[PDB]
């Protein structure tokens, strides 16, 4: 259909917070939309408040890209042709595009208070609360000399055309606002700032930007973002207007967008508690897109062989937890195991829940509990019961596995255990078996649960054989012993 589009996307958050779900959604959206395209990713920081901004909450942003996998063309760190990529860098590219927008009369210095915005209001019988007038567009010479002799600040608004602004919208259809409807807006404050309504859509123009994605949230910057794209082609500083596609908002529980205040909002919290980038990135992609109707399980690559912007719906795109965990889950699970080892260990390690095994022997202990987990944090309560610190048994599983009846099981397990010549899983299973089984023809449950509650706290822990191997002969002696007290 069939030409592929030659695609400039971009990522521009502000570093304010930490990196918003939402927003991480936007970023795969544009990263998997370029490569998917053979197009260039753009990476740019919109820093222009010193007030809410930090440098902590930039170096986050790298960070979240980084750790998901989504490298940028063009932005921080890397430079590209366009630069600098943070906004608050670029002060002088944007006093000159003022300049320039100033002398053509697109733009125009304005002196109104909002004072006397809503007084005109009022003594035309028109809504005093509607905004400004246009009233500075009609200044004479004089009385706009007259204004700066008084020592007037003014502020740099747009002139609007007078047509309909519109654009047919790639998730959206088509959208306009009428012929008047807006009111030529504030590029700067009194102070000469500019304010995002000149530097987001200065950037897209002078970073050649062909294709907005952004969450439908900002859809009503658009018009004044085309009437400002616009003004910038018949100055000859920009020659297209980009195409416009917003995403559907992230959800929350109800109607209402995620919430920044939210901890699920947060991709880092996600982070901590043991997401992997796999994980995440697949449940973000489903945040606006489907990969398939018939599954919604897949990687990075996938993503970028199918992935196109005609694609997204506006369909509510609710945050569900357990669909995130779900997903994390499966792909914990599609991990190699020298991988999800190596993950693991540090995950645990990273959050102060060493598990006391040599480094072979966690190998072995990760193998078995890579299918029992949705998040790597979640290995700490199946795995803490080799730390013989963090062992205890649980009172409802030896009040019901310990009795009189359990206490005989142990006994003869313990004779059984002496026994065993090499201290391996085979053995130990062999040896108990022989006796609890063969011997004393007990069912399977009775044979093993007290053995299971004895050596490792509770009626549910991983493979029982494997696990008494790794406690060693000395620990699982012990507990056993102890246990039919
Ligand atoms: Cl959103």
Redesign the pocket.
Same mark, same amino acid.
């Not at 544009?30 to 919109?46: C, M, P």
């Given at each position: 259909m069939t030409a592929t589009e030659t695609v400039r996307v971009r990522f521009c958050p502000s570093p304010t917070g930490t990196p918003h779900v939402? #927003?991480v959604?936007?970023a795969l959206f544009n990263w998997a939309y370029a490569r998917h395209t053979g197009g260039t990713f753009v990476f740019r920081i919109e820093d222009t408040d010193a007030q809410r901004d930090s440098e902590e909450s930039y170096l986050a942003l790298l960070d979240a890209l980084r750790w998901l996998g989504l490298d940028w063309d063009e932005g921080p760190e890397v430079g590209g042709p366009y630069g600098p990529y943070r906004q608050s860098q670029r002060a002088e590219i944007y006093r000159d595009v003022l300049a320039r927008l100033l002398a053509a009369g697109e733009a125009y210095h304005a002196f109104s208070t909002p004072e006397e915005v809503e007084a005109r209001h009022v003594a035309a019988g028109r809504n005093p609360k509607l905004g400004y007038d246009n009233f500075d567009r009609h200044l004479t010479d004089a009385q706009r000399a007259a204004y700066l002799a008084e020592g007037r600040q003014p502020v740099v608004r747009l002139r609007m055309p007078d047509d309909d602004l519109a654009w047919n919208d790639l998730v959206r259809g088509p959208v306009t606002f009428a012929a008047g409807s807006v009111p030529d807006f504030a590029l700067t404050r009194a102070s000469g700032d500019p304010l995002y309504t000149l530097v987001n859509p200065c950037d897209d123009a002078l970073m050649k930007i062909t294709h907005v994605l952004r969450?439908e949230?900002l859809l009503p910057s658009t018009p004044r973002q085309l009437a400002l794209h616009q003004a910038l082609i018949r100055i000859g500083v920009a020659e297209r207007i980009p195409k416009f596609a917003h #995403?559907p908002?992230?959800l929350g529980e109800g109607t209402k967008? #995620?919430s920044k205040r939210d901890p699920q909002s947060n991709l880092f919290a996600h982070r901590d508690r043991g997401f992997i980038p796999e994980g995440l990135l697949n449940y973000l992609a489903l945040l606006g897109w489907s990969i398939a109707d018939d599954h919604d399980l897949f990687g990075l690559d996938e993503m970028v062989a199918a992935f196109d912007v005609a694609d997204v719906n506006s369909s509510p795109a609710r945050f569900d937890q357990k669909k995130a965990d779900a997903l994390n889950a499966e792909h914990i699970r599609m991990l190699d195991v020298g991988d999800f080892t190596v993950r693991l260990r540090d995950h645990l390690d990273t959050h102060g829940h060493h598990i006391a095994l040599d480094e072979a022997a966690f190998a072995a202990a990760a193998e078995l509990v890579q299918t029992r987990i949705v998040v790597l944090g979640d290995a700490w309560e199946l795995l803490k019961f080799f730390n013989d610190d963090q062992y205890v048994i649980d009172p409802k599983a030896a009040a019901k596995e310990l009795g009189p009846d359990g206490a005989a099981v142990l006994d003869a397990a313990l004779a059984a255990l002496t026994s065993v010549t090499d201290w391996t899983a085979p053995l130990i299973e062999a040896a108990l078996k022989d006796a609890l089984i063969e011997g004393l023809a007990l069912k399977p449950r009775k044979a093993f649960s007290p053995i299971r509650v004895a050596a490792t706290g509770t009626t549910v822990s991983p493979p029982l054989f494997e696990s008494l191997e790794l406690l060693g002969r000395d620990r699982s002696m012990q507990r056993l012993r102890a246990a039919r007290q």
């Amino acid at each position: 259909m069939t030409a592929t589009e030659t695609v400039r996307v971009r990522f521009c958050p502000s570093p304010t917070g930490t990196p918003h779900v939402g #927003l991480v959604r936007t970023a795969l959206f544009n990263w998997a939309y370029a490569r998917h395209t053979g197009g260039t990713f753009v990476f740019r920081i919109e820093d222009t408040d010193a007030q809410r901004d930090s440098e902590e909450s930039y170096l986050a942003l790298l960070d979240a890209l980084r750790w998901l996998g989504l490298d940028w063309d063009e932005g921080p760190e890397v430079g590209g042709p366009y630069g600098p990529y943070r906004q608050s860098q670029r002060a002088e590219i944007y006093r000159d595009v003022l300049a320039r927008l100033l002398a053509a009369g697109e733009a125009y210095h304005a002196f109104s208070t909002p004072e006397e915005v809503e007084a005109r209001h009022v003594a035309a019988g028109r809504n005093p609360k509607l905004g400004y007038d246009n009233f500075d567009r009609h200044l004479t010479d004089a009385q706009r000399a007259a204004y700066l002799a008084e020592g007037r600040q003014p502020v740099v608004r747009l002139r609007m055309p007078d047509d309909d602004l519109a654009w047919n919208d790639l998730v959206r259809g088509p959208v306009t606002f009428a012929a008047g409807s807006v009111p030529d807006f504030a590029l700067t404050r009194a102070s000469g700032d500019p304010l995002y309504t000149l530097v987001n859509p200065c950037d897209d123009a002078l970073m050649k930007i062909t294709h907005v994605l952004r969450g439908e949230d900002l859809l009503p910057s658009t018009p004044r973002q085309l009437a400002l794209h616009q003004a910038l082609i018949r100055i000859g500083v920009a020659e297209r207007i980009p195409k416009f596609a917003h #995403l559907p908002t992230v959800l929350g529980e109800g109607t209402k967008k #995620l919430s920044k205040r939210d901890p699920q909002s947060n991709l880092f919290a996600h982070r901590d508690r043991g997401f992997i980038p796999e994980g995440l990135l697949n449940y973000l992609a489903l945040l606006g897109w489907s990969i398939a109707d018939d599954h919604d399980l897949f990687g990075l690559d996938e993503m970028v062989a199918a992935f196109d912007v005609a694609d997204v719906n506006s369909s509510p795109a609710r945050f569900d937890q357990k669909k995130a965990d779900a997903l994390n889950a499966e792909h914990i699970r599609m991990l190699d195991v020298g991988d999800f080892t190596v993950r693991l260990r540090d995950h645990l390690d990273t959050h102060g829940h060493h598990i006391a095994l040599d480094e072979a022997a966690f190998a072995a202990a990760a193998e078995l509990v890579q299918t029992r987990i949705v998040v790597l944090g979640d290995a700490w309560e199946l795995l803490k019961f080799f730390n013989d610190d963090q062992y205890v048994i649980d009172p409802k599983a030896a009040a019901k596995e310990l009795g009189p009846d359990g206490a005989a099981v142990l006994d003869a397990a313990l004779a059984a255990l002496t026994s065993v010549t090499d201290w391996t899983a085979p053995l130990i299973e062999a040896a108990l078996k022989d006796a609890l089984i063969e011997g004393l023809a007990l069912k399977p449950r009775k044979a093993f649960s007290p053995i299971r509650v004895a050596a490792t706290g509770t009626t549910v822990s991983p493979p029982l054989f494997e696990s008494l191997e790794l406690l060693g002969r000395d620990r699982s002696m012990q507990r056993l012993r102890a246990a039919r007290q």
